Ligand binder design. Structure first.
Ligand SMILES: [Cl-]
Ligand SMILES: [Cl-]
Ligand SMILES: [Cl-]
Ligand SMILES: [Cl-]
Ligand SMILES: [K+]
Ligand SMILES: [Mg+2]
Ligand SMILES: [Mg+2]
Ligand SMILES: [Mg+2]
Ligand SMILES: [Mg+2]
Ligand SMILES: [Mg+2]
Ligand SMILES: [Mg+2]
Ligand SMILES: [Mg+2]
Ligand SMILES: [Mg+2]
Ligand SMILES: [Mg+2]
Ligand SMILES: [Mg+2]
Ligand SMILES: [Mg+2]
Ligand SMILES: [Mg+2]
Ligand SMILES: [Mg+2]
Ligand SMILES: [Mg+2]
Ligand SMILES: [Mg+2]
Ligand SMILES: [Mg+2]
Ligand SMILES: [Mg+2]
Ligand SMILES: [Mg+2]
Ligand code: NA
Ligand code: NA
Ligand code: NA
Ligand code: NA
Ligand code: NA
Ligand code: NA
Ligand code: NA
Ligand code: NA
Ligand SMILES: [Sr+2]
Ligand SMILES: [Sr+2]
Ligand SMILES: [Sr+2]
Ligand SMILES: [Sr+2]
Ligand SMILES: [Sr+2]
Ligand SMILES: [Sr+2]
Ligand SMILES: [Sr+2]
Ligand SMILES: [Sr+2]
Ligand SMILES: [Sr+2]
Ligand SMILES: [Sr+2]
Ligand SMILES: [Sr+2]
Ligand SMILES: [Sr+2]
Ligand SMILES: [Sr+2]
Ligand SMILES: [Sr+2]
Ligand SMILES: [Sr+2]
Ligand SMILES: [Sr+2]
Lengths: 194, 237, 92, 56
RNA sequence: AAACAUCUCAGUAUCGGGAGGAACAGAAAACGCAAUGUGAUGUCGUUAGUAACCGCGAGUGAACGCGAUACAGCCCAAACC
RNA sequence: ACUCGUACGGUCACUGAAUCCUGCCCAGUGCAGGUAUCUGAACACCUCGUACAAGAGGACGAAGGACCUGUCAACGGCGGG
RNA sequence: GCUUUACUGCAGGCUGUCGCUGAGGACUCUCACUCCGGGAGGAGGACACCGAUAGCCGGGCA
């Protein structure tokens, strides 16, 4: 039969309809009054969290992060530039907001490592994402067959190097064939043209 | 070119800042729960550096000692009241609703409880004209009819120091001393007297703006100089 | 100059002389779906857009005849070199 | 008053001093920032790729 | 580009953040020598200055495949408990 | 920042103590106001086109402009016959 | 370097539109949101602010 989880999932396919709509309208009032990074005892979207690797266990942390909506916040050129490099208003950044969110969360918890993250909505001026972080130093995790991998040294600060799922997508690594000529194995090795 | 003086101002550097560390106090009305059971005695009259007008130190019943925006005619010993039931006499504060029409007032709040925003300068006053259950109509010093919430508090009488403007500075040195007590860069160099690089009016053999002075409201900073969005100019017509 | 609306001349289609009707070539409306239209959208962005920032050239003092020659029997038209003419009015 | 020799006589202010962190006489005692190693400004050590030729 | 604005120089210089002894990538919602065919991923040689881009100017410029190197394939979420 | 400031304020400009004065010009340019009618983009809407889409046309029309008015201690002008 | 009714652009301001954004060609309301208030509460209100986009102005700047 259907899992109870599928109902949370199904609710979130249309965050603007049904009960979920009223919940968001209510919640966001409280969220707008919270900080940039707020640790939370439980995921707002359980199905998604468990699906991304979450577990109700010691060493597993979840934090909601908010970021200002819109494009880049850039300063106009102070020195000479050709029309092409004078743009200021319509220029957007190369990292999506979810990625910016994952990084802020990881800075707040220097000892934890980003596992994954997901969207929990937005209003007209900001977006919220919840991030799952793991304590690579806690034995409950060092002994977990499904998560101990994140304890390896080369997984340190993984988010800052784009090793996250959101990181990999944003780097154009989804496709294994056509279109990934300049993304795989890295944007850098391909001269930064992807 | 280079940023014009109006643009240097905004950075709020020392040259353009007000000597705040030398200012005395923020003359906002007292906050009373209700009842008007708040009265104090004028303990002294002081000089207010930020306004070139006198201010009065008051000792209230509950022990609070604070400076107040003094109207003309207030002296030491006198007793002042602040509240809904305050008496209708010079130097007393109460909501416009309690003030009888046709009474000159000063230090009028814009939004009930803000402490006073209007008519605070030397010898000026707002004129309470119309009352109502929903809107109190006041005539501000500029002659503008302002609709205010009857719950907006004010002080009866006119501000002390009137006539200050009637005497000429006579000397540059006198202007100088006053200017040193304000957030203002002085003296003033005319735009037409500067180099083209420093102002829209700079440059040219003889001095003269090389353009009409009436500038559009939409002009960007750096260009909005001269006569801003003038509806007209001159004295004629 | 004057020009006869219809006259006998060679029709490269029938391959024989037949009566033709002469008409001024009317401009055909664009579709906005040609490759050039797509390149304009693709290559125009922030700042100067190269060739897509240029504007309409000038005009020669006189233009050449721009006519269609329609065969009166097979109904097909053919084109010819034009010649400079200040004005071109047809007779009948 | 000339900007040269006569204006050099007024110079008796102490600014740059031996830095506690790197040992260079670059710790600005007024800013409390070392212009050589960055002490007082950053935990990380002051460094720049332009301190050497690009390909070296 | 014998000017110059798209283009070029170049994702170069330089800047911010971060890991390791190497990084990154990686077990197909691939490829599309179209097939009765190949079978994770780097890299090297080639494919090729080819396809593609471009005031269609100056210039920019892959991939599939093939020959090599080395080879390795697995774990969750959910269903049922 | 101005600002512990509030029109007897302070911002932006011009002239440059006192004294006697400061004429005519609103066509152009600038600023500002108004505007029946005209013109005026995108989204949504309607027609055609496409089993869809590109696209073509339409209707509506903001600021702006046309047009009208105010204004020279606003740019400036005050000739030839 | 400087100028402007040189060319081409870029900030910025005005303006429409879409999202924030809710209930019953003009309107009421309150619940988001904004502001005032120490607080209770008051004012305002689906506007404004902010994101996106479109038109106009645009030597302030390149
Ligand atoms: Cl991390
Ligand atoms: Cl003054
Ligand atoms: Cl013709
Ligand atoms: Cl193959
Ligand atoms: K260039
Ligand atoms: Mg298992
Ligand atoms: Mg590599
Ligand atoms: Mg005060
Ligand atoms: Mg000063
Ligand atoms: Mg002056
Ligand atoms: Mg000079
Ligand atoms: Mg000079
Ligand atoms: Mg200038
Ligand atoms: Mg002059
Ligand atoms: Mg050249
Ligand atoms: Mg390029
Ligand atoms: Mg050429
Ligand atoms: Mg290239
Ligand atoms: Mg291929
Ligand atoms: Mg003068
Ligand atoms: Mg002089
Ligand atoms: Mg506030
Ligand atoms: Mg220039
Ligand atoms: Na971390
Ligand atoms: Na790309
Ligand atoms: Na393109
Ligand atoms: Na050259
Ligand atoms: Na040159
Ligand atoms: Na090009
Ligand atoms: Na082969
Ligand atoms: Na005129
Ligand atoms: Sr670290
Ligand atoms: Sr105040
Ligand atoms: Sr206050
Ligand atoms: Sr001048
Ligand atoms: Sr006059
Ligand atoms: Sr493009
Ligand atoms: Sr452009
Ligand atoms: Sr010509
Ligand atoms: Sr000197
Ligand atoms: Sr000397
Ligand atoms: Sr000295
Ligand atoms: Sr510091
Ligand atoms: Sr460095
Ligand atoms: Sr293999
Ligand atoms: Sr005089
Ligand atoms: Sr005029």
């Amino acid at each position: 039969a259907r899992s109870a989880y599928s109902y949370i999932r199904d609710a979130w396919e249309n965050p603007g309809d049904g009960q979920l709509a009223e919940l968001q309208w209510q919640r966001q009032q409280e969220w707008r009054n919270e900080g940039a990074v707020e640790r939370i005892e439980r995921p707002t979207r359980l199905d998604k969290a468990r699906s991304q690797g979450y577990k109700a266990k010691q060493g597993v942390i979840v934090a909601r992060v908010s970021v200002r909506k819109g494009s880049a916040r850039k300063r106009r050129h102070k020195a000479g530039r050709r029309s092409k490099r004078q743009g200021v208003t319509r220029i957007t950044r190369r990292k999506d907001i979810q990625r910016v969110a994952e990084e802020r969360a990881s800075r707040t918890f220097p000892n934890l490592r980003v596992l994954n993250s997901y969207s929990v909505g937005q209003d007209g001026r900001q977006k919220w994402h919840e991030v799952i972080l793991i304590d690579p130093n806690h034995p409950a995790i060092q002994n977990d067959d499904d998560l101990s991998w994140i304890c390896a040294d080369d997984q340190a600060d993984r988010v800052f190097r784009g090793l996250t799922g959101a990181g990999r997508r944003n780097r154009g690594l989804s496709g294994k064939g056509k279109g990934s000529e300049k993304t795989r194995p890295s944007l850098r090795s391909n001269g930064g043209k992807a | 070119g280079r940023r014009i003086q109006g643009q240097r101002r905004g950075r709020g550097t020392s040259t353009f800042r007000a000597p705040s560390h030398r200012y005395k106090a923020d003359l906002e009305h007292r906050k009373v729960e209700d009842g008007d059971v708040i009265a104090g005695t004028v303990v002294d009259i002081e000089h207010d550096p930020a306004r070139s007008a006198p201010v009065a130190a008051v000792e209230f019943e509950d022990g609070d000692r604070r400076l107040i925006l003094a109207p003309e005619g207030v002296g030491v010993g006198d007793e002042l009241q602040v509240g809904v039931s305050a008496e209708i006499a010079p130097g007393n504060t109460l909501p416009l609703a309690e003030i009888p029409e046709g009474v000159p007032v000063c230090n009028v709040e814009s939004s009930p409880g803000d402490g006073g925003k209007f008519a605070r300068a030397s010898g000026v006053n707002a004129q309470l004209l119309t009352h109502d259950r929903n809107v109190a109509v006041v005539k501000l010093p500029s002659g503008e009819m302002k609709r205010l919430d009857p719950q907006c508090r004010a002080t009866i009488g006119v501000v002390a120091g009137g006539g200050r403007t009637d005497k000429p500075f006579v000397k540059a040195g006198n202007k100088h001393h006053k200017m040193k007590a304000r957030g203002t860069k002085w003296p003033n160099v005319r735009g037409v007297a500067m180099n083209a690089v420093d102002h829209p009016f700079g440059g040219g053999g003889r001095q003269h703006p090389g353009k009409p002075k009436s500038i559009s409201r939409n002009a960007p900073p750096g260009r909005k100089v001269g006569d801003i969005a003038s509806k007209r100019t001159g004295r004629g017509g | 100059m004057q020009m006869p609306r219809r006259f006998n001349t060679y029709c490269p289609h029938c391959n024989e002389h037949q009566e033709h009707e002469v008409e001024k070539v009317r401009s055909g409306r664009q579709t906005g779906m040609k490759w050039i239209d797509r390149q304009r959208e693709r290559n125009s962005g922030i700042g100067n857009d190269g060739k897509f920032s240029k504007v309409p050239g000038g005009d020669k003092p006189t233009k050449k005849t721009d006519l269609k020659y329609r065969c009166g029997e097979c109904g097909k038209a053919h084109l010819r070199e034009g010649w400079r003419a200040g004005r071109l009015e047809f007779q009948e | 008053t000339g900007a040269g020799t006569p204006s050099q006589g007024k110079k008796n202010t102490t600014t740059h001093t031996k830095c506690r962190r790197c040992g260079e006489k670059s710790y600005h005692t007024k800013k409390k920032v070392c212009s050589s190693c960055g002490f007082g400004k950053s935990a990380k050590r002051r460094d720049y790729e332009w301190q050497s030729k690009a390909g070296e």
